[PDB]
Design a protein around this ligand. Structure first.
Ligand SMILES: [Zn+2]
Ligand SMILES: [Zn+2]
Lengths: 242, 141, 385, 78, 186
């Protein structure tokens, strides 16, 4: 019974489906998205922990690779070369590279993490360290905007909330990047807007308006059968509800 | 879905008791029905959809008893149970017994046998259910 | 023979021709009036059968091969007073204690722990849609003569599963149940479905959000087809319609993919009476080139005078599953109307935004683009469910 | 264990004639008898010597019968 | 048949023939120099090397594939000791991975290492020469045998003429057992 779930037809030996159809190809060329794209999984603590591990590992390899490549090239040259003074100079270079790799080994994880806007091989991280389960750009956004330690993850202070409200009014509730910059607590535009919307009287309304009531009544009468109405789905059409 | 919680026990107890009486008369079945007071089953703070699907499944299960391989008096008791369940319901419209195509003809032959057997109580009860059109012409029960 | 049999107990049945099955049902009922759409006489208490006695006793005597006095005696014996131990005036909202039913003992056990100030309520019991649609349509008749169900017509129950699927549960399915007539063409069922995929739209509009596409997927594509008994039924009424079945035939017949030989037909060539179909066995439907639905023929029966006879409503909807609205991540409460990718402001990609949050975040008063992001208009299937 | 006791009693009865040994048991080859000897000698050289000294009367029917009975008993109880 | 987009195989598993050949060639020479080839069947080790090379050319998905699935896809009769040879090479792979700074810091494992084989091969020679100073021999006898070929006691004495005579009595049958032997195979 359960064998017939989507896709309805699936290849018996490989499980693949038919190639892209003409209608599907045109729709893709028109940029029409699919419903499967809306499926997103919550960041469990393991996902974050191994993202952190991946970032530290990436930075470690980035720092080490030039040093160890230099050391290995130097050792190859020392092995092939017979000149004594040049051999001693190459040996000294190898000792320097050894000391450099040792102090990099001794560097702390925080120094390895570096700044928020540092460069990383997000593509390689994605497809080799999480096997492509999450997209490289998605991982980049998550890290740089929420997970990197420089992000202000602390709870909002009451003074911070009051100043946020005041400067949001000052900025006309627009350009929330400038709002966050003026707040001065290293907050992001998205954090500021989410916070304001969660305590904005204009969005969440206890009162009512003529257009909201009219459209609620219209949708209710069009859809309602007996006692049932889409209480929480009417919110798509009118603004300021659940 | 299956069966309501406890309905199977009440139905089997009623059918077993009616069998042990060794009587096919409808008087005995109604007397048991009134004594243990089966008709309350359609009360008890069950709402509209609840009465509808409870009656549907109860009628389907009463039909399950009404079918073979159980012998004459068991099927007679099951028909009396079908009559009671349908005529003591409070649905609007009265919900119908789901009966299969494969079962309509066999029940018609059973009604004819009841007529030939001169036990006209069961045949009359089936005809009364037919007048109520208490049954739905379905492919499966 | 077209004799329905269980292929798996209470799960699915063998295949049979709908027309032949309906003809067999009518043959077992034609001329008896049991399949008629006209109100028959009903049972009553023995104290009120005097008016009905003249009409009933003679017919009973004729059918049961018993005397008129025997018919009257049977009627008195089978009086509802012998079974109506509830008075017609008793409310159903209370369990009557004068009973020995185990069922009502269980009902009492259920109700007792629901009378505290925290638990007492008259809320939904387990579902709502079914009875609402029933009471909205049951027993009604059409306002037009041409919209009347034929007496003894077949009623088919068809379930269509939603494109959005749980992927974590398998006992239950997300579906909507329709009722269709034997004589109806499949064109009506194809045209009736209001699937959200028809509302699908595309295009990237971060620079100019107000320039959303003028055409929904329904206005650009019309390819749709049904799948029964190995047959494709593709629509070709319009130039936008394409016979999707040809590509899948080419793909599948070239290799042992686990399915047999297939053949193509149009959508308007068949009525519900022309199909040879199973009950409970899953089947397939598709539209928009890619939006596949699972089709299950849950039930089939002749029409009854108590059923909905108003064909203006047909195809009928009688049961509907639920999908959760896609709430935008900014306020986490309001429903999203926009989604962005590559968005520097957004903490995650993709990020969904409401029409309120989207504009006020990504644009200034003039509507100029702010930051780096790509934005797409979004239609919520959890809303248009 | 009981099968070990059987090789010991057999080789008491008849000596170390692995061919006749393997014939009388139903599914044991001469190679199996040799391998069993090579395994057991280290701990049961005393028992092999006792068996060589134990020139027990080798009756055909008696031993065939007691075999069949004790194989049946072991199979049932095992 | 891994290198053509046949209908029976997904295109996911098509590569460059020369890259595959080079990966497998360098893996095979590594196995050779690590004493994994002498006195044994080459076909299982070669098969293992091919499987690991193919996996390493895209660890993203091939890490989920099994060698049994591999031979099914390729229509190849896998030798029974292929799994054992693969395990041996994996142990050698971990012994090699311990050498490099990044790998040893990352604390890799038998499975996750699949995505660094090219890196290892890049610096094979120096690292393996360093690792040898810690050789390979049959793992069965690498169990740290504290005693090797112990000298047996000298028992070259053969007596003078006869050390005992009851042995003949012990090795001869009594007349009872003689009759018993006669009736044994009647
Ligand atoms: Zn759809
Ligand atoms: Zn908003």
């Amino acid at each position: 019974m359960g064998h017939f779930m989507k896709p309805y037809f699936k290849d018996k030996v490989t499980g693949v489906g038919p190639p892209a159809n003409e209608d599907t190809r045109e729709k893709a060329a028109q940029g029409i998205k699919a419903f499967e794209e809306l499926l997103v999984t919550k960041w469990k603590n393991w996902e974050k922990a191994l993202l952190r591990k991946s970032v530290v590992s990436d930075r470690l390899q980035r720092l080490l690779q030039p040093k160890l490549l230099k050391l290995e090239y130097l050792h190859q040259k020392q092995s092939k070369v017979s000149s004594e003074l040049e051999r001693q100079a190459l040996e000294k270079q190898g000792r320097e590279a050894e000391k450099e790799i040792q102090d990099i080994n001794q560097l702390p994880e925080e120094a390895l993490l570096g700044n928020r806007l540092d460069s990383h091989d997000w593509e390689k991280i994605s497809n080799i360290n999480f096997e492509g389960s999450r997209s490289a750009e998605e991982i980049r956004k998550f890290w740089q905007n929420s997970e990197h330690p420089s992000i202000n993850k602390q709870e909002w202070s009451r003074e911070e909330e009051e100043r946020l409200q005041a400067i949001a009014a000052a900025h006309g509730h627009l350009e929330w990047q400038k709002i966050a910059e003026e707040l001065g607590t290293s907050r992001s535009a998205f954090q500021c807007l989410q916070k304001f919307q969660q305590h904005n009287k204009a969005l969440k309304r206890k009162e009512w308006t003529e257009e909201e009531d009219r459209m609620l009544t219209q949708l209710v009468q069009e859809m309602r059968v007996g006692s049932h109405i889409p209480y929480r789905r009417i919110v798509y059409y009118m603004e300021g509800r659940d | 879905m299956g069966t309501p919680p406890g309905l199977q026990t009440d139905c089997e107890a009623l059918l077993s008791r009616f069998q042990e009486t060794d009587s096919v008369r409808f008087e005995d079945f109604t007397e048991l029905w009134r004594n243990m007071k089966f008709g309350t089953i359609f009360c008890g703070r069950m709402r509209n959809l609840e009465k509808n699907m409870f009656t549907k499944e109860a009628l389907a299960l009463a039909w399950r008893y009404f079918l073979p391989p159980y012998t004459f008096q068991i099927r007679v008791g099951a028909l009396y149970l079908l009559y009671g369940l349908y005529n003591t319901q409070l649905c609007q419209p009265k919900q119908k017994i789901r009966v299969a195509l494969k079962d309509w003809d066999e029940v018609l032959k059973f009604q004819q046998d009841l007529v030939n057997a001169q036990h006209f109580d069961a045949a009359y009860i089936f005809r009364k259910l037919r007048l109520d059109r208490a049954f739905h012409f379905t492919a499966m029960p | 023979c077209n004799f329905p049999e269980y292929e798996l107990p209470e799960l699915n049945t063998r295949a049979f021709h709908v027309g032949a099955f309906g003809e067999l049902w009518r043959g077992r009922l034609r001329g008896a009036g049991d399949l008629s759409l006209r109100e028959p006489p009903a049972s009553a208490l023995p104290g009120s059968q005097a008016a009905d006695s003249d009409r009933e006793d003679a017919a009973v005597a004729r059918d049961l091969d018993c005397s008129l006095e025997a018919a009257a005696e049977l009627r008195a014996v089978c009086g509802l007073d012998k079974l109506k131990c509830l008075e017609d005036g008793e409310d159903p909202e209370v369990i009557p204690e004068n009973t020995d039913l185990v069922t009502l003992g269980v009902r009492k056990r259920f109700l007792e722990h629901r009378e505290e100030t925290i638990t007492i309520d008259r809320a939904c019991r387990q579902e709502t849609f079914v009875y609402e649609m029933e009471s909205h349509a049951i027993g009604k008749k059409p306002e037009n003569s041409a919209d009347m169900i034929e007496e003894g017509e077949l009623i088919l129950s068809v379930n269509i599963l939603y494109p959005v699927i749980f992927h974590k549960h398998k006992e239950h399915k997300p579906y909507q149940t329709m009722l269709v007539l034997g004589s109806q063409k499949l064109t009506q069922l194809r045209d009736s479905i209001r699937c959200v995929s028809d509302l699908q739209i595309g295009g990237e509009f971060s620079n100019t959000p107000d320039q959303a596409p003028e055409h929904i997927s329904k206005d650009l594509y019309k390819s749709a087809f049904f799948y029964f008994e190995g047959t494709f039924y593709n629509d070709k009424r319009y130039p936008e319609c394409r016979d999707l079945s040809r590509t899948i035939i080419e793909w599948s017949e070239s290799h042992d993919r686990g399915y047999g030989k297939f053949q193509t037909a149009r959508m308007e060539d068949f009525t519900f009476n022309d199909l040879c179909i199973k009950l409970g066995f899953p089947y397939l439907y598709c539209h928009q080139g890619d939006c596949e639905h699972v089709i299950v023929i849950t039930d089939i029966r002749l029409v009854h005078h108590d059923d909905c006879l108003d064909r203006t409503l047909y195809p009928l909807l009688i049961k509907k599953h639920w999908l959760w609205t896609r709430k935008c991540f900014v306020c986490k409460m309001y429903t999203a109307r926009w989604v962005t990718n590559n968005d520097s402001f957004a903490p995650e990609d993709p990020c969904f935004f409401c029409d309120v949050c989207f504009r006020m975040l990504h644009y200034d008063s003039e509507g100029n683009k702010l930051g780096e992001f790509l934005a797409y208009p979004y239609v919520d299937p959890g809303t248009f469910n | 264990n009981k099968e070990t006791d059987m090789f010991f009693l057999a080789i008491s009865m008849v000596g170390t004639d692995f061919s006749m040994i393997g014939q009388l048991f139903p599914h044991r080859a001469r190679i199996e008898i040799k391998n069993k000897f090579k395994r057991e000698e280290k701990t049961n050289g005393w028992r092999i010597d006792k068996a060589f000294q134990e020139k027990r009367p080798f009756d055909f029917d008696f031993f065939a019968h007691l075999l069949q009975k004790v194989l049946a008993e072991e199979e049932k109880r095992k | 048949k891994l290198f053509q987009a046949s209908p029976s195989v997904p295109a996911k598993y098509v590569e460059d023939k020369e890259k595959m050949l080079s990966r497998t060639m360098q893996l095979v020479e590594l196995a050779n120099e690590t004493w994994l080839v002498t006195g044994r069947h080459p076909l299982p080790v070669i098969t293992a090397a091919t499987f690991l090379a193919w996996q390493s050319l895209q660890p993203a998905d091939r890490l989920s594939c099994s060698l049994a699935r591999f031979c099914k896809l390729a229509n190849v009769d896998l030798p029974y000791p292929a799994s054992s040879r693969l395990q041996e090479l994996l142990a050698v792979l971990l012994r090699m991975a311990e050498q490099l700074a990044w790998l040893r810091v990352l604390r890799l494992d038998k499975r996750s290492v699949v995505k660094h084989i090219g890196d290892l091969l890049q610096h094979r020679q120096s690292l393996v020469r360093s690792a040898f100073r810690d050789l390979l021999l049959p793992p069965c006898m690498l169990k740290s045998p504290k005693r090797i070929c112990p000298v047996p006691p000298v028992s070259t004495v053969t007596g003078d003429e006869n050390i005992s005579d009851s042995e003949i009595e012990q090795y001869l049958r009594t007349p009872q057992e003689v009759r018993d032997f006669q009736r044994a195979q009647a």
